[PDB]
């Protein structure tokens, strides 16, 4: 057997997919020696995070690294990753509680562009598994990096709301990803769940996703959220760009829509006025 999500993105296991692409991850710290991602992820010197809330906070590496380690595994993990040949570079913009700032994210996006200009490699994919309120400056920085030729993928947000009220979800040039479950339905998360609406480009597996756990060097855990869904699309984009490296952003977006499974989501889950605005697409690899 295979994790449900990897079976779902397979049209009805590439061992080195996405090798021409570098995926930048802006997230928490990562456990770079975890067997699932060791050697595949390069930890940059970049760190820009706010102080944790509560004066008695205990900074335990296993807890601090949880979010980012799981997402690095979803993208390129040896056993459970989508694009097993993709190289990753991590930047720390989220603290041990998963909180960051718009300013830290802006400085991180600038660091990525500066790094690219100093030592260019192949096509770049930037994964932003985070969200805040609508931000003019964050949308602008994302638009400028996309216009410079970099592919950006972001989480739609986990607020069961219109993604246009959040950033970078609301930036049109960024590929915005909602989450679906094993029944191909939108993911519920407590009393909230995946965002929806016209700012979402497509959905991808985002519930009970097996990936690297920072509890131990060989541990695995299931996680849910639009971050996990965005990580699937970053992996699929790395695979598509490695197969066709000359694709422009517009062409890549066309490929993602073309190969997605269509009309499998029950639109009744979304609010009435959002059904015609939300794309009924679940991401999948090309055959």
């Amino acid at each position: 057997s295979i994790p449900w999500n990897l079976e779902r993105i397979t049209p009805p296991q590439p061992p080195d997919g996405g090798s021409l692409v570098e995926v930048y991850l802006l997230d928490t710290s990562i456990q770079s020696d975890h067997r699932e991602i060791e050697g595949r992820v390069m930890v940059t010197d970049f760190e820009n995070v706010p102080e944790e809330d509560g004066t008695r906070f205990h900074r335990q590496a296993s807890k601090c690294d949880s979010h980012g380690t799981h997402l690095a595994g979803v993208v390129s993990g040896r056993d459970a990753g989508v694009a097993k040949g993709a190289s990753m570079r991590s930047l720390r913009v989220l603290n041990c509680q998963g909180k960051g700032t718009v300013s830290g994210t802006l400085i991180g996006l600038e660091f990525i562009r500066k790094s690219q200009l100093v030592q260019p490699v192949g096509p770049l994919v930037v994964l932003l598994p985070l969200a805040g309120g609508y931000s003019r400056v964050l949308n602008a920085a994302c638009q400028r990096l996309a216009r410079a030729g970099v592919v950006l993928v972001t989480a739609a947000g986990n607020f069961r709301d219109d993604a246009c009220l959040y950033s970078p979800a609301s930036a049109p040039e960024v590929i915005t990803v909602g989450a679906t479950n094993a029944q191909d339905q939108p993911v519920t998360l407590g009393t909230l769940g995946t965002n929806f609406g016209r700012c979402v480009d497509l959905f991808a597996p985002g519930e009970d996703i097996i990936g690297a756990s920072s509890d131990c060097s060989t541990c695995f855990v299931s996680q849910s959220g639009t971050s996990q869904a965005a990580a699937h699309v970053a992996g699929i984009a790395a695979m598509m760009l490695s197969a066709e490296p000359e694709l422009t952003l517009a062409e890549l977006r066309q490929r993602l829509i073309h190969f997605s499974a269509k009309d499998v989501i029950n639109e009744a889950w979304f609010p009435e006025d959002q059904r015609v605005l939300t794309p009924n697409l679940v991401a999948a690899l090309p055959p």
Partner: peptide, 10 residues
Amino acid sequence: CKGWWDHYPC
């Protein structure tokens, strides 16, 4: 899938 394992479950 849901769970936690000390090795790759599949």
